[PDB]
Structures are given as C-alpha cells and as structure tokens.
C-alpha cells in the first residue's frame, strides 16, 4: 500500500487568515487525490477530487493543487465554519485506498 | 437527500462473528458501487472493502483479507458486510459509503452515519 | 582543465539494453477500476427478437 | 411526425415538490428510451436522467441523484419525472428528448419544446 | 463526469466563408461525440453523431472530424440560416452525458 | 483467514509428468496473482513461477523454463502447476503462494503448507 | 539472475540479546528486499518488505535498513520465540526472484 | 523442454528477397527477446539482430543495417527475419536464439537447429 | 539499403530562416544519432551539429552556435535542422550523415544526396 | 545568436550577501562551462569563478575564495554566483562568460551585457 | 564494433590434461564475456557468463577468469566428451555482439 | 578546435603506382582519425577509421597507418576507379570534428 | 597567480598607421594567451587565442606573435573603428587566469 | 444503425468462373448477417443466414463465410442462372435492419 503523510499534524489559525495543508506521498500517485473535511461527530465530506477539481456545492474558497507526491490544500480566507479535521485521500490505480493522519484546524 | 443508515453493531467477543447492514433509501442502488470505510478511535480513516455494481468483483484491504465478506442485494436495496474472526484492532466506527461515479475517480460523496463495532472482554 | 562537455561522446542507442519483459510487474487486479454500471448502455428494446409464436 | 408535449411546470418555493409530464404523440414510446435535459439560464445544457424502454434501469446525473425521480408509463404514452427538494440551481427550462436508438449512440433526435420551472420565494 | 470545452466561445463570420468550431475534452472520449445546433427559441437539433457521421436530413456543408480529445466541426460554406449556438455533447461509456458551453456565430 | 492447501504430490520416475493443485479457501482468488515457491532439501528457497490475476502473463525461473506450466482457473478457486521432464534436482517441497498485492512489491504472505514431490528410482 | 548472499551462515545468541543479519547483493537492487522467518515444520512468513517497512502483525522488535547491496535485519531484543531460519529475498524489476541460503538462530 | 526450429532457407540469386521463420515450441515466447546468429562456412560467428519482447525496439549489426528486417509475432508463437538485397557474404547457416533473460547479460541459451541459406548462381 | 534524402533548399536573403529535412528510409532511425555536414563551395568539409538517439543532447560547431537548431522526430523517421540569422559563409551544400554506431568512433558512413542552400540577394 | 542577460545587482552594505543570475538564451547551456569575470572601476579585469558543464568541479580566484559560491541550473538555463561577506574591494560590474569550447583554451567569446554591483554604506 | 581475438587457434591435448584458452579484446569490456562450446553438427551451447559464472547444468570442471581485455577459460581435467570448438563472445554495453575465431581441441 | 592539414594538396599519378597521402594534426589526436574518398558529384565514402582499421566493403588496397599527429593513407596499387578527393577527419574526445583541406589524385 | 604587465599603457596613433602592443608575463606561459578588445561601454571581444591564431570573424588586419614571456599584438592598418582598449589574458595550466592593465589607443 | 459496405459494386465474369463478394459492416455484427439474390423484376431471395448456413432449396454452389466485420459470399462455379443483384443484410441485436449497396454479376 501507499502511506499518506499530511503536514502539519495540527496548526491553529484565526478567521480571515490563509492556511495551506499539504499531503506527502511515499511514491508517485499521479494526480488522483481527494480531500475530506470531518467536523467532530460528523462523517466527513468531499471537497476536492482529482487533486484540483472543486466538488459541487463546496464554496470556491477551498482550493487544491499539486502533482506527483506534492499536493496542497489552500484556503483563501478561513471562516469560522472551516474549523475541522482535514484528510487527504489517494486512489491511485493498482494500489489500495489509504488516507492521511488528519490535519486539525484550531481557533486562534 | 440520499441517506444511508447502518445497523447490526454492538459488542462481541474476539473470534466471534457479526453482521452489518447498510439499507439505503431513494438512491439508485443497483447502478452504483459502494464501499465500507473504517475509522479507528485514533481518528484514523482506513478503507475496508468495495463491491462492483452487480457484485462481479470484490476488493478488500490486506489487513482484512479472508476475515471480512461483503455482498450486495439490489432487490431489497441494502448492503451487507459480514464479519468473521475479529480481533482488538477492529474496534472502530464503520461507515457506509458510495462511489461518486467518476470514470476513474474513486471518491466517496454520500457517507453513511456510521455504526459502532466494539470487540473486548 | 577542459570544463566543457565531450562533443564526441557515444550518441547512439544501447544495443545491449535488457530485451525482456519484467518478471516482477504488478500481477494483481486493479482495486480502483470503475465499479459502477454504464449509464450509456443502450436503453432501447431489441427490434430483432423473434416475432413468431 | 413525432412531437413531444411536456407540462406540469410553474414556480415553486425551495424545498417543495413538483411533477413534470412528457406526454408523447405518434411516437413508439415503449421501444425508445427517454431523456430529460436541463438548459440553465446561463446557456448551458446539463443532462438530467434517462429511463430504459421498460423501466428496468434508471440513471441520473450527480447533481440530481436522490432528489429527482423519473418514471415511465407505456400505457398512456407519457414520460414522467417527479421533482423534489429543490433549490435555486434547478431553475431552468426543462427539455424532453428521445434517444435516436443506435446500438451505442446516446444522441437525441426529437427534442421537446421545454417546460420552464422557477424556484423562487 | 467529463468537462467538455468548446472553443472559441464566440466567432463572427459572414455568409459564404469557411468556419470551423472545435471542442476540447478533459480526457479521451474515443469517438462518442455529438454536435447540436440551437437557434434561439428552439431546442437544439442534432447534426453529427460518432463525431464524423452526418445525421439524416443534415446538409452536406455540415461536417465533423477528430478523435480522442481533439475534434472539429467544419462548415463547408456558411449560410444565412446557419447562424445559431452550437454545442458539443459526448456519451462515453461508463460516463455521464455532458454538454459544451455553446459557441455563438454572429452576422458579419 | 485464508489458508492454502496444496495437493497432488507423490513419487515419480525421472522423465514422467505430475499435476499439482493449490485449491484455496476464503481468499478473493481472481483478484490476486500467485506464485510457486520451491524449497530444496538443502534448506534453500527457490522461486518457480508466477501467473497474473487473469492468466494473461506467466514468468518462470530459468531452472524450469520449457518444463513447467502454471494455469489458473478462477471458477473453482484453484491454481495448477503441471510438470514435464523432471529430474533429480526437482525433488523438493513445493509451497503455494499469494502475492501481497502491493504497487511494486513482490512478496508472499499466505504461504501454503507444502506438497512433497520425489524424483528417484 | 541476482545472487542473494547473507552473512553470517549461523549466528548463535541467548534470550535478551541484539543480533544483526546482513544480506549482500551481487549487484544493486535498490530497496526491494524482504526478510522471511522459517520455523522448522512450517512455511516461512513475511516480516519486512521494501527492506525497511515492518509488515502488519510483526513485533516491532524486528528492524530492517540499508539500500543498494548492503542490508541489515536487526532484532532489538531476542525473544524465546525468535529462534528460526532467516532468509533475504529480492524482487528487483527485470530480474527474477531469488533467495539466500538462510541463517540459523541457535539457542546459546 | 523448449526447442527452436527454423525454416524458409534455400537458394536465391543475389538481390532477391527471402523470409526466415523461428517458430518456437513450449517457450514463453512473449516474455523473451530473440536474437539471430549467423555462422559463415569459415566457422566464424556473427550476430545479426535482436528484437525486444513486444517488438518495441530492434538492433542490427552494421553489416546488415537497412537490408535485414526482423519482426516478431507473439500470437502465432514465432519470429520472422526478412532478407533484402542479399549478396555473396550472406551465404551461411542461420541459427535462432533466445536471450537468457538476465538483468544485463546478453547471452544465448536455447539455440535452434539452423536453416541454411545459399546465395549463388 | 539505407538512403537519406535531404530537401528544403533554395535561396534566401541574409537574416532569414530556413528549414531542412533528412527523411530517412529503411534505417532503424531511432537507434542512431545523426550529424549534419556542410560542404562549402571551396570543396572544404565542415561539421555542423549532432543530436543523440532520443534528442537528449545536441552539439554544435562554434560557427553555428546559437543560430542553428537541430531537432529529430523519431516517429516520422526524419531529422530537422532549422537555421536562423544566415549570412554569406553559410552558402554551401548541406549533407545529412549517420554516425557509424561504434563504441567511440564518431565517423559518418551513410551520407545523403545533398541539399544546396544559397544565401544572397 | 547567443545572448547572456544578467540581473540581481544593486547596492548592499559590507558583510551582506547578494545573489547574481546569468539567465542565458538560445545557447546549449548544459554542454558549456561558464565563467564570471569582474571589471573593477579602474578598468582592470579580474577572473572570479569557473563551473564545469555538470557542476562536478568549481575553481575560484584567491581573492574570492570561500566568500563566493557559484552554482549552475541546467534545467533553467541559468548561472548563479552568490557572494557572502562582501567588502569594499568587490565594487565592480560583473560579467558572465562562456568558455570557447576548445580542448585547452579557457578563452571567453560570448560575454554578457553586465550587472553593476555596488558596496557602500 | 569490438573485435575478439582468442588464442591459440588450435590446441591439442589428451584426456586428463589441463588446458587454458584465452580471449583478447580490442578494448575494455569489463566482465561482459561468455564462452561457447560448439560440437560438430550442433549449435554452440553456453558455458560461462559474466566471464566467471558457471551456467546451469554445465559440469563444474570448467572455470573462467579475467577482467578488462585478458580472459581465460580453464578446463580442470580434460574428458573425452570435451573435444570441440570454443568461442568467446562479448556483450559490452553500447557495443554490438561479436564472437571470436574459435579454438579447436584436437585429441592427442 | 583542431585544424587538420593534409599534405600535399595534389599528387598526379598513373595506374599501378603507389601513392601515400599524409594528414598532420596541430595537436595529439591519439588514433582517432578517419579517411574519406569523395568522387566528384557524390557524397564522400568512408575508407579508414581508427587510423588503421579497414571499413567494411572497402577493397584491401587501401591501408592507413600512424598515430599521434602524423597519419598516412597508402594505396598499394592505384586503380582507375581510385581517382578522387581524399579527406582526413578527426574525432578526438573533448574536441569538435574537423576535416582536412582535401588531397586530389590526377591521372598522369 | 601570474601577474601580467603590458606596455605601453597608452599608444597614440592615427588612421592607417601600424601599432604594436606588447604583453610581458612575469613567468613563462608557453603559448596560452588571448587578446581582447574592449570598446567603451561594451563587453570586451575576443581577437586572438593561442597568441597567434585569429578568432572567427575578426578582420585579418590583427596579428599575434611571440612565445614564452614576450608577446605582441600588431594591427596592420589601424582603422577608425579599431580605436579601443586592449587586454591580454593568460590561461596557463595549473595557474589562475589573470588579465592585463589595458592598453588604450588614442586618435592622433 | 449499422451500415454495411459490399465490394465490388459490379463484378463481371463468365460461366464456370469463381466469384467472391464481400460485405463489410461498420461495426462487429458477430454472425448475424444474411445474403440475398435479386433478379430484375423479382423480389430478392435469401441465400445464406448466420452468414454461413445454406437455406433449403438454395444450390450448394453458394457458400458463406466470415464473422465480425469481414464476411464473404463465394459461388464456387458460376452458372448462367446466377446473373443477378446480390445484397447483404444484418440482424444484430439492439440494432435496426439496414441493407447493403450491392454487387452485380454481369455476363463477360
């Protein structure tokens, strides 16, 4: 399998700031990634697929990019809602689906 | 707006079996592949199984090979995952999931609520 | 000393590169193959079924 | 010469249900599949759903999965679509269609005029 | 789903010339492409299926070509009744039907 | 849990043929490539062959090229290796195998018990 | 082929000790190695893959490292159950899978 | 056990064409690249050409560059070498070959019987 | 028998561009690096440029550094040399060449017919 | 036509660092070693550094030993010289250069335009 | 190309003797050499690869040695079945495959 | 660059004599030299490479010799077909390929 | 390093005359010199390398001569354009490259 | 719809000759193709179904072959009564019945 590493483990930010979350691959996974948001107590939901495409119904503030093993999730202006746990998921062909540890967004 | 409910959880002894159900509502069940996603109490997310739209092929994560058997029955519109020979690393919340439907995109969009499965003594 | 490249280095291909298939490929099915049904499958009836009793 | 008459529209509030009909004329409804096509005010065409010749199988786009329900009644020559849990993005002119009938070609030949649905308050 | 992008969005021409409209695919669709022309106040009518085959009743000045992701709809000679919005639609297997943005051809 | 039981052993004269089987249980047979691993009486481990998931490709160690043939048949969940033109070296304990399934990692996880083949006079 | 040679042929130690087993490659094999433990009367089982990654369910006292032609399997604290035969197996691309001779672990 | 048999030899005037075949038996032909080796009557050994497993790349000795075309057909389990513009130097006994399959060693293990080609008048 | 035909010649004014081609035939063009050789009207021979088999590296004579660019298209079996900022000393017959293929001998064997380029007004 | 454009100059205080660039154009930059040449206001020239084609070796004048670092990026077709612990003697316009390419001639042919670097307070 | 010279052209010996056949290269071929034995009426068979390694199934009485351009094939004890023509073949990288002249072993 | 000077520029000779053509290098070129024969109206053909080896298909009456800076091409018995312009070309390492001025052969 | 002194510092001359610039090395530099011409505001241009060889594209009126520690650059017929500053450079092996002080040519 | 092309359009031959008419479908039609003979003033009569099976009462001189896209009718020995227009028809499932263009057999 492929080990998914996302850094930082936990970073705090204030409303209106710019926060970027990366995800590191053990080896190349093409551009087949997916970012997940999990509010505590709630099942997680999809934001980005194909590592760059915004899913329908998700605000355009969320933004992802990167290729190969470097992938970053970028938040244009962090709002009080977006405080949650963020996961990066890969679905490369011939390899099994794994997730990251989960970056945490903490207020102030 | 597409709700997946799961049932059949509880607490069982190690090595015992248990059945899970993922009865769906208002979703076109027979035309969509479905997954099972496991979230350990350590907040880690791990994929478990996936079954094709007619159940022609089944895939499992290596950690659960030979122990978990999953199947789909389109007629009454529910999904099953039968558990055999469990152990202490299967204590987790179990999420039903639905593949988005992309040509090559295996991403989950309508997650289920989740049913807790605990094994201890 | 000459700091430049060698303009007369062997520019041809290698006629002794390994001419074989890789015995260690990934010999497995693809777990991430499209698991869904085909929405573009022909939804029309067959006009060529038997018209006789 | 095959003309498709569609009706049942109007203005509805977000979250309320609405029914659209696609009563046909002189077309062999039973042996042909049918399609719903949504033309947004921004001059874009989005495919909505397709129903098989006898209703055996049923497909939807991702944006309308679980919120839209189509049905096919061969008896009185109509195609039906029930429209539920709406919001603003569903405000568009709704076109009926008929797949040409090729072996592998999903192409519409005899389009309907369109019945326009407003989601507003 | 496949984002099916047609360029140019708007191209002006006068009656009698040669005008070509193309449509870009995000990934390979083989030859399962279709073209529709939409005059204002009327539903679109099919012209080309299989990305190259003229539909019945379609004038011979209409012509489609291309494969994979690169396709071209070529006008043999633009006529006064050929001024409308043109769309590109694909029906690739195991994929959902999507349309193009719609190219507008305008007088002079 | 996945166990591999091999059979078809015995003692044969040099130059005769022999059929082997690796009827598997509780494993998703069609989704995994398999190997055959040979352990000589001198406690040396030697790889023999490998067949892909659907049987498209086969690779053999040069020690058995042109003499050994593996065949996979998914329907009854079994693996075959039929031997021709044996000799004194080919006397060893034969294990089944199941490739772990990694992206590029060729490792064996669920080894079989082992079936003994003797070539003598 | 590529010859797998591991040293020492036999290494005896008592419970609680730390032992290192080295495997020498005839030519560079990158990092695609594995270590197997054969308890007599049983088929060998998997311990390490990719020459550094611990398998699932293996005790963490087993450690592997190295790249190229010099690789080492290290046991942090030798345990009463850990007396068996150890092999080094490589699966380098375009080369066939070969095994070593196998080191014996003997009590005291 | 793997045997290679050649055919298609005979007598040809200089400047005519000729086709040579290396139909193989019991060899996993698709996985192995194949060479052609030419032995002149003076007991000298010359290498002719090599084709990869899929036929992606070819390499010829300079003495036959542009005159010899070798092609491999995996489906019929055979190899072809077509000769154009022959002369007195191309009269020899032609052996097929089979690269041993190692990482970096280009050596031949299973030679064929050989087919004789005569260029004279 | 390996023939190289060059084209694209003519007359151009100084400072203008010009493209040259070396469409090869019956040669395994992909395996061989190629050279361009210029023969001045004074019957002198000047080496111009060389490109490797896959185009990884290019080398130019100091008289054409930065003004001449050579590129190779393996798919169409042809070689290109594009010249910019020409002047009077570049008026000559341009010969395509083919490196012999030896380990360390950069010697041309199969030359082309030749293309004449005139720079005047 | 080979143009070397430098940048990154300005005025800095003694003891501060400063980075210079030598972005080249139309030159086969990877195959040529490059030099930096310093021209003092007294109109005297001084050599600074040389970098080999692939970065294997570097040589510096003794007046810049350990304070100047020169690095080359073949992919971006540019040359870098970063100075550390600058002092008053380093006020001069800095030239890029390209070694002629001869077997034993370290002579500069295609000089750059020039970048003025001032150190003061 | 690289020409291969093997000496002597002919070397006669009787049963039980020890003989050495050399192969001299025009330029360094590292250890990429092979030795072939051709009996009359048959295609040559592989004896040594990598200039020192024994091929499978060949009696161990043959031994190879050398590096660079000077290489030696030694038969420890001549046998009645080992009387044939011997060829040395190189496979140096970036150089094409060539063979030697062929040493002959004649009885008595 | 290394400029080649081949001397003398022109030798008249008849059929059957022996002619020697020299090529002088300004600096050592080891043995990396090649000789070309250009008949008028044709592209030159390769005769000698490595300054002593005969190219395939060239009649044996051509012979080359010398190393360092003094290299000679010798035609043992001139034939009526052997009247052409002869160029010496070096390919020394780390130096660019250059050609000689061209020696001509004139009948009688 | 090797200090270079060239004399005279300033050499006044008119159009059509003949000037000689001398460049004396403090120690023998064999024949490894180079002569540069710098026009005001421009990067210096190469004229002579190897102390006697004319660089490409330089008018033939420039001539270099000398060996050892005494070298001369002579302009056959000074042209209005050839009024500039001239620098001599050595690149002797095992020594670092140094430039001259700069000889100026002044009109009249 | 499926479009078949049958070649040649017209094939003239004499009595006793052997003639082969082909039928190429736009896409694979398995074996669901049938051939007909049509004499002037008469409706076409069936010759072969399943593209290979002879109809009752049809002379054995007519034989059909082919599958997929390439099919052929062969009349082994042309007789005077076999001068007519012959067509090919497909009945592939999920496809509508369309019909070919036509090969005509003409006397001499």
Author numbering:
A (entry chain T), E (entry chain V), G (entry chain R), K (entry chain L), L (entry chain P), M (entry chain N), ...: 1 to 95, 95A, 96 to 107
B (entry chain S), D (entry chain U), F (entry chain Q), H (entry chain H), I (entry chain O), J (entry chain M): 1 to 52, 52A, 53 to 82, 82A, 82B, 82C, 83 to 100, 100A, ...
C (entry chain I): 28 to 80
Copy text verbatim from the article accompanying this structure deposition.
Each of the extended helices in complexes with 337, 334, 311, 356, and 239 are right-handed, while the partial, disc-like helices of 364 and 227 display left-handed curvature. The extended helical structures of CSP in the 337, 334, and 239 complexes are each unique, i.e., non-superimposable. For example, based on our cryo-EM structures, a full helical turn encompasses a minimum of 10 and maximum of 12 NPNA repeats, as observed in 337-rsCSP and 239-rsCSP, respectively. T28 is a germline residue that is nearly strictly conserved (S28 in 337), while the S31N mutation is seen in four of the seven mAbs: 239, 311, 334, and 356. Other key residues in CDRH1B are R30 and F32, which in both mAbs 239 and 356 form a signature motif R30N31F25, mutated from the germline sequence of S30S31Y25. To create both 239R and 356R constructs, the RNF motif in CDRH1 was mutated to germline, along with the same E64K mutation in HFR3 (R30S, N31S, F32Y, E64K). The light chains of 239R and 356R had one and two additional mutations, respectively (239R: R56T; 356R: Q1E, R27Q). Interestingly, we observed some helical propensity in the 239R-rsCSP complex, similar to 311R, suggesting helical structure formation is at least partially germline-encoded or that CSP has a preferential bias toward a helical conformation. Strikingly, however, 311R, 239R, and 356R each showed a consistent and dramatic reduction in percent inhibition relative to their WT counterparts, which was statistically significant in each case (Mann–Whitney U test; p < 0.001). Protection for these mAbs generally ranges from around 85–92%. mAb 239 is slightly less potent than 317, at 81% inhibition, while 337 and 227 have the lowest levels of protection in the panel, at 68 and 52% inhibition, respectively (p < 0.001; Mann–Whitney U test).
